[PDB]
Amino acid sequence: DKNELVQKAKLAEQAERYDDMAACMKSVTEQGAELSNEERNLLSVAYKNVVGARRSSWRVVSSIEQKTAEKKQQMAREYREKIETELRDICNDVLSLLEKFLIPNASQAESKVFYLKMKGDYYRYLAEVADKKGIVDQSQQAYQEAFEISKKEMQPTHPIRLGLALNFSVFYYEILNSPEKACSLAKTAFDEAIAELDTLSEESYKDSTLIMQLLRDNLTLWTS
């Protein structure tokens, strides 16, 4: 079952067929057992493209709404609330998934912070989509808890912590509109990355630097 399910994902990943992979990872994670590293990132990325494709589509539909009668405006509206409903469904499946199974069974500290970042990231998606303040506050709570736990265990250059900080800064900027705090957190994260950038694991070598780049671009774009 589990091996068959991860194979049905490894065969749906290469094929760009993303809904099948989302529907299979959900089934493999509702098993109630722990998710080791290989299925972890698979579940994460699966849901990542599923929600992000709809988010990008919603962005374009909203852009056309900004780029404009009583019918030409309206047609964009039904499409945007349709994409809104479907993205809300897809994010609700995962958030309920972590609350029911993933977070309570997070044995490892890195797994705990990883799932917490996932949780906060989806609530950030709902926050951008949308009463409204509840989602943004809950996302802030999830991000704050993830940061607080991640401050202890793993090496300060770790991809989970780095992406968590970058997401958290994006949250301060695009929702709460706190650019000063966003640049502050991103800046400290980046400098501590430089300071701790000793000899590093080859496995995380590429990805750590890849996140550090995007960190630098947020700093540079937010300087102005």
Binding site: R59, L166, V170, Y173, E174, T199, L210, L214
Partner: protein, 412 residues
């Protein structure tokens, strides 16, 4: 203390030690400038001899070095015009970089083949008299506009050949025959020309101004929504001009006149008979005008005809470096012959560090391709137009700041 330079001429003195490679030591500075130590090259001089990154500082003590430039691959299936960038073919399914936007196929780094793409007289020599010569309008590389008044708005030029041979005049009647058929929305109308007076190139007249005026006199810097649309409307116009093998060969920021900030018009091109002056009976081309908008090969003039379809693409890399930064390249060199010798020899190229902060990293593999030292590498205009169409609509998708991207997702 081993001092090493940086792009934009920044200075950093890495510590001198023994046993540890330059990679992780210089890594701090390269990341503060955001450069991976695997895509960089450093130089030691005993002009500039490259050295790698696995060198101990024991032999590098007391030496000055330069830092100059020389990927996560998800899978995707492109849903519109998307051209491979390793074989320059047409790509439908294949990899893609998450941020750098460089699209390629595994086969080119019982197989399948290509397919259809996703689809989606009246003119004659202007006679004298009726052509009302314009007034003092200005100058440029080889002439001056004269705003004509004949059943509309037109422009009149003057040229640097006074009494050419009749066989040159027949070549002129041929070149107008091949060039007046440039019917486009990105090219102003070509009414004709008057050869009874001093030889003239009659064109239309456009309001507003050129691009050089807009970006170095008013300096009304736009947003990327218009910054990419300008390059799109210019790439389309220089693709229509390249389909029938008529090189513009004069792409300058001061001849792309745009009206009302919506319509983009391109003109003042070609004239291979007026250029390549007939001092005898030859085609000896002359270096007249500005210098930043032609390639190292055009500067060299090492061939009888060193132009190509490519040397009109490097002239696009300069006009795009101009649009992005807002300034011209080589605005720091307080010299002229230094600029000529430098761009010719190839020891130095326009500096990429001076681009803007909101620079779309996907175009960092387009406007960089448009500015290689070599000529066989810069892409022809259909691929530039496709790669600009791609992010002319993919801009609202990345209208936000950065975010955590997906994983490696590439297996070999």
């Amino acid at each position: 203390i081993v001092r090493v330079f940086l792009p934009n001429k920044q200075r950093t003195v890495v510590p001198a030690r023994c046993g540890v490679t330059v990679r992780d030591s210089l890594k701090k500075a390269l990341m503060m400038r955001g450069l991976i130590p695997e895509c960089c090259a450093v130089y030691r001089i005993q002009e500039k001899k490259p050295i790698g990154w696995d060198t101990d500082i024991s032999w590098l003590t007391g030496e000055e070095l330069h830092v100059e430039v020389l990927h996560n691959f998800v899978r995707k299936t492109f849903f519109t015009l998307a051209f491979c960038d390793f074989c320059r073919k047409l790509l439908f399914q294949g990899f893609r970089c998450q941020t750098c936007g460089y699209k390629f196929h595994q086969r080119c780094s019982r197989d399948r083949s290509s397919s259809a793409p996703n689809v989606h007289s009246d003119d004659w020599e202007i006679p004298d008299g009726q052509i009302t010569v314009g007034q003092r309008i200005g100058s440029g590389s080889f002439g001056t506009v004269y705003k004509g008044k004949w059943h509309g708005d037109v422009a009149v030029k003057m040229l640097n050949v006074t009494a050419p041979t009749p066989q040159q005049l027949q070549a002129f009647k041929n070149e107008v025959g091949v060039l007046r058929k440039t019917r486009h929305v990105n090219i102003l109308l070509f009414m004709g020309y008057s050869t009874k007076p001093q030889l003239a190139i009659v064109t239309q007249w456009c309001e507003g101004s050129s691009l050089y005026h807009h970006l170095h006199i008013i300096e009304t810097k736009f947003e990327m929504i218009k910054l990419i649309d300008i390059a799109r409307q210019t790439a389309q116009g220089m693709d229509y001009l390249h389909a029938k093998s008529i090189i513009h060969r004069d792409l300058k920021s001061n001849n792309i006149f745009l009206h009302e900030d919506l319509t983009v018009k391109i003109g003042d091109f070609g004239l291979a008979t007026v250029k390549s002056r007939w001092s005898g009976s030859h085609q000896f081309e002359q270096l007249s005008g500005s210098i930043l908008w032609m390639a190292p090969e055009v500067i060299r003039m090492q061939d009888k005809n060193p132009y190509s379809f490519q040397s009109d693409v490097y002239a696009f890399g300069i006009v795009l470096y101009e649009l992005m930064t807002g300034q011209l390249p080589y605005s720091n060199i307080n010299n002229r012959d230094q600029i000529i010798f430098m761009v010719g020899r190839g020891y130095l190229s326009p500096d990429l560090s001076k681009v803007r902060s909101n620079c779309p990293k996907a175009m960092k593999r387009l406007m960089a391709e448009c500015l290689k030292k070599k000529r066989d590498e810069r892409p022809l205009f259909p691929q530039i137009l496709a790669s600009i169409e791609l992010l002319a609509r993919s801009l609202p998708k990345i209208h936000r700041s950065a975010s955590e991207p997906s994983l490696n997702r590439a297996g070999f």
